[PDB]
From a paper:
Protonation of key histidine residues has been long implicated in the acid-mediated cellular action of the diphtheria toxin translocation (T-) domain, responsible for the delivery of the catalytic domain into the cell. The function of the T-domain is to translocate the catalytic domain across the lipid bilayer in response to the acidification of the endosome. Remarkably, such a complex task is performed by this small 180-residue protein without the help of any additional translocation machinery. Formation of the membrane-competent W+-state occurs in solution upon acidification of the environment to pH below 6 and is accompanied by structural destabilization and partial unfolding of the T-domain.
In order to further analyze the putative pH-dependent structuring of the TH2-TH3 region, we crystallized a full-length form of diphtheria toxin (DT) harboring the H223Q/H257Q mutations. Notably, two crystal forms were obtained from crystallization solutions at pH 5.5 and 4.5. The first crystal form (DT-DM-A) was isomorphous with the aforementioned WT structures, whereas the other form (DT-DM-B) belonged to another crystal form. Not surprisingly, the mutant structures also form domain-swapped dimers and are similar to the WT structures. Interestingly, the TH2 helices in the mutant structures are well ordered in a similar manner as observed for the WT pH 7.0 structure and could be modeled on the electron density maps. Interestingly, the Q223/Q257 sidechain conformations are distinctly different from the H223/H257 residues in the WT structures. Moreover, the acid-induced destabilization of the T-domain’s short helix TH2, previously reported for the WT, is no longer observed with the DM. The latter is overall consistent with the spectroscopic evidence presented above in Figure 2 for the lack of efficient conversion of the membrane-competent state in the mutant. The replacement of H223 and H257 with non-titratable Q residues suppresses the ability of the T-domain to form a membrane-competent state and disrupt the bilayer yet has little effect on the protonation of the other four histidines.
Residue numbers in the entry:
A (entry chain B): 3 to 39, 48 to 187, 200 to 350, 354 to 536
B (entry chain A): 3 to 38, 48 to 187, 201 to 350, 353 to 537
The structure:
């Protein structure tokens, strides 16, 4: 009983779920669910068709191969979803008193097990969380009981007749109706067109002729590529790319050039003539954010027109850098296909719901510091009661000793005050009390009463204590900021003195 | 019951503990503990070195004088009541005290001493002293505390040493380790400053000084030159040798430190040691002066520490005319204040602390951040046949950086990688893995779809281990004590390698 979350268990009629299917098995699987020729051996499905589709790619070519499809499988009649709180077979069988020999999924398909936990249903399906960061479940079915499932087709990616994995990824992008929902046929065509025509452009032909066109050093291949990147960017095909990449130093020509040098150095002949091997090699390079226009938590390049421009620019740069630092046409063929595949992976990551830095236990990384709420409950300021709470914040830095100057805390007249007594900061166990003064009616600032430094080997725990004088709940009208502000070292941003700001974002909730 | 930790509670005869004491009370307090709301009480600790932390001039807490540490003993029998939570309201409920009477009034009554003292003549509350500390704090009811006898452990002021040196030399005893003589370091510093400013090339280089306000780039350029020259004098000879390779100790950082010092020290500030300390304590870059980098205190001999501080004193003096607001500071309060910050950081590094990638301390490297999700995750338990799971958090600070794979320990029998349950999830997208042994002690798992992390994209790497033998695992059987998560591919000494993100585990039995 300590192992079953009944809150997530239920019986249902015509229980449905989804199963990703690999190329070839799409039509065969509609015949019926059959085990092919250990405690957890069973048929696996999920409640999220979009997460199912990720199980659907050619296993001989998982990175770049073709995507099969998704089938929906339904049990006729009544089905008991038994949600389990732990994924250790031994543990389960004990706290349920099962045959510590019989495999767990062996036992789950027996009349006896179906009797005990079935609640009147014809069979049991186990439910576990799909993954960390996911709200989906994975369903584990017994292979005998699975003989009863009807199999309808949800989608077959092969039928859609699109290039690469475009079908699978445009499917997954439906999950978000924000949302990067790009037409990759449009982007592929625009890309081809822009490459072809940029090649025929006068200043580009001109700038190519100036190329050492032979093996050289990274330092000068990089210099040339930076020059090629500047002139290329001046042509009308790349006018919008020029405008969106002029400010953010992540998108500068020097990073395009470093990318291009790095691709050209690692792509041999064996590699270039295979999409799977190409993708694997490219997938371990740093700096891809430069080409994607992804930085600071945002996909900036989010229109078909600007993505194809960026990919076209990058395709030419690889072409130029290959004779300078390489070893061989790939720049227009396998390179473009592989990099489109990588765009799709990363766009999909950003489409999926996720906590930003400084939310829940996701670290906030800035100026060499790393700061985070110690547990999920710490990031929650409970409301609607008279009294006290504590909130732990972890704090360190990557290398040398960097200071912590203090922390800015939210206050709300009557409902949220800084317990100045219990608020402190502890550095490798050394407990440091704080002097807290109010700035205005909504912000208190606490400073350590002896110096705080963190670094490699030196971490701090910032303990914030809140007091509530009323039991009236906080309403949104009442609170401006949603972050606690830990202040690092003092710097001069904009001819003016400021502290590095390490932000930890809280949620106001009731019990 | 649910609120009291029997295991850390006990009755003791002549229970003693320690109390830090401010200047002007080291003698007063020995006459007796008198009071001069829930937690209103007298505070002591089982750790006399932590107690020494509370001994500093409350009006000058950064830099003021340290008072002393006294030992306080109850005669007869005393109950130490250790509590699992620190919320007064929770306590009173789960123990059935009155929700009106404050906790530290309740605990000093015969009704509480009857019910909770196990026969002792009074109760003391024990709570954990701080995160990252093994000490406890004791909360003594004030009236009961009248029975305490008070003996002197140490009076820092009678040592008659400069600054806070007596306090910090006492604290350094905890590790029998950085145990420097600051009297010696002060004297060597005075001496080296005095003889350096009379050296020929130093006087020569001081003539070349603009000796007027100039640009920050200009003064930086000048100070780097002064640094090179000074470092060639024989007073700094060993310093020259130790700061030659590591770029954190380069002259450009000394230069940057001195520039930033001069820019924040105005006249009010230079004339007050507490204000100078306040201002210096929030500057970046001090680790260059302290010789502190990569988790280690490099300058750990009195001669080298004096050399670095002497050098910095001179540079501060040269830098003030070029970006300043005032020059006796560089040898008066600057050296006093910086000696103090030295002592703080040294003390941090003397205290036991988990290093990056140990337990839940993050490993920060090449823009990534990785950590064991929980303390238990970092533990590979042994002594049974079966399975365990281990979660590792992964992200990066800005652009998408890849995760190539992970290297995992194996042992022919006592430990194999469970390739079914081992996986990696990226903002919820579950990614199966291809694992291939690399010898008999190291398996390498690759993601079957590309993995990138970055601002707003994180991964959970789930490692599943299988044990075939109940036989425990022995120290010899296991080569590495770390799990290797591989970042992007880079070149180091003409060879390709992945960024290495290390998570250090401990092997243990269970109970």
């Amino acid at each position: 009983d300590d192992v079953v979350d009944s809150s997530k268990s239920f019986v249902m009629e015509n229980f449905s779920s989804y199963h990703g299917t690999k190329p070839g098995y799409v039509d065969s699987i509609q015949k019926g669910i059959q085990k092919p020729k250990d405690d957890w051996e069973g048929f696996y499905s999920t409640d999220n068709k979009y997460d199912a589709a990720g199980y659907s790619v050619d296993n001989e070519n998982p990175l770049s191969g073709k995507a099969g499809g998704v089938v929906k499988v339904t049990y006729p009649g009544l089905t008991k979803v038994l949600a389990l709180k732990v994924d250790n077979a031994e543990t389960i069988k004990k706290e349920l008193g099962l045959s510590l020999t019989e495999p767990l999924m062996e036992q789950v398909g027996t009349e006896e097990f179906i009797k005990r936990f079935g609640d009147g249903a014809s069979r049991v399906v186990l439910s576990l969380p799909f993954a960390e960061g996911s709200s989906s479940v994975k369903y584990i079915n017994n292979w005998e009981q699975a003989k009863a499932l009807s199999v309808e087709l949800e989608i077959n990616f092969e039928t859609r007749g699109k290039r690469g994995q475009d079908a699978m990824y445009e499917y997954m992008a439906q999950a978000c109706a924000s949302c990067i929902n790009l037409d990759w046929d449009v982007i592929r065509d625009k890309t081809k067109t822009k490459i072809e025509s940029l090649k025929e452009q006068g200043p580009i032909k001109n700038k190519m002729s100036e190329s050492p066109n032979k093996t050289v050093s990274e330092e000068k291949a990089k210099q040339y590529l930076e020059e090629f990147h500047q002139t290329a960017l001046e042509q009308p095909e790349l006018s919008e790319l020029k405008t969106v990449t002029g400010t953010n130093p992540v998108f500068a020509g020097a990073n395009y050039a470093a990318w291009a040098v790095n691709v050209a150095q690692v792509i041999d002949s064996e590699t270039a003539d295979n999409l799977e091997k190409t993708t694997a090699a490219l997938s371990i390079l740093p700096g891809i954010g430069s080409v994607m226009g992804i930085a600071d938590g945002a996909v900036h390049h989010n229109t078909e027109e600007i993505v194809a421009q960026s990919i076209a620019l990058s395709s030419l740069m690889v072409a130029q850098a290959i004779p300078l630092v390489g070893e061989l046409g790939f720049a227009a063929y396998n390179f473009v296909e592989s990099i489109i595949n990588l765009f799709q992976v990363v766009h999909n990551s950003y489409n999926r719901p996720a906590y930003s830095p400084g939310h829940k236990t996701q670290p906030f990384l800035h100026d060499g510091y790393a700061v985070s709420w110690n547990t999920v409950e710490d990031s929650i300021i409970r409301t609607g009661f008279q009294g006290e709470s504590g909130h732990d914040i972890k704090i360190t830095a990557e290398n040398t000793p960097l200071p912590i100057a203090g922390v800015l805390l939210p206050t709300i007249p009557g409902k949220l005050d800084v317990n100045k007594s219990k608020t402190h900061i502890s550095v490798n166990g050394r407990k440091i009390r704080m002097r807290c003064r109010a700035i205005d009616g909504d912000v208190t600032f606490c400073r350590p009463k002896s110096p705080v430094y963190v670094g490699n080997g030196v971490h701090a725990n910032l303990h914030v204590a809140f007091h509530r004088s009323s039991s009236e709940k906080i309403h949104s009208n009442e609170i401006s900021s949603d972050s606690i502000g830990v202040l690092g070292y003092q710097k001069t941003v904009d001819h003016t003195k400021v502290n590095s700001k390490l932000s930890l974002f809280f949620e106001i909730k009731s019990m």
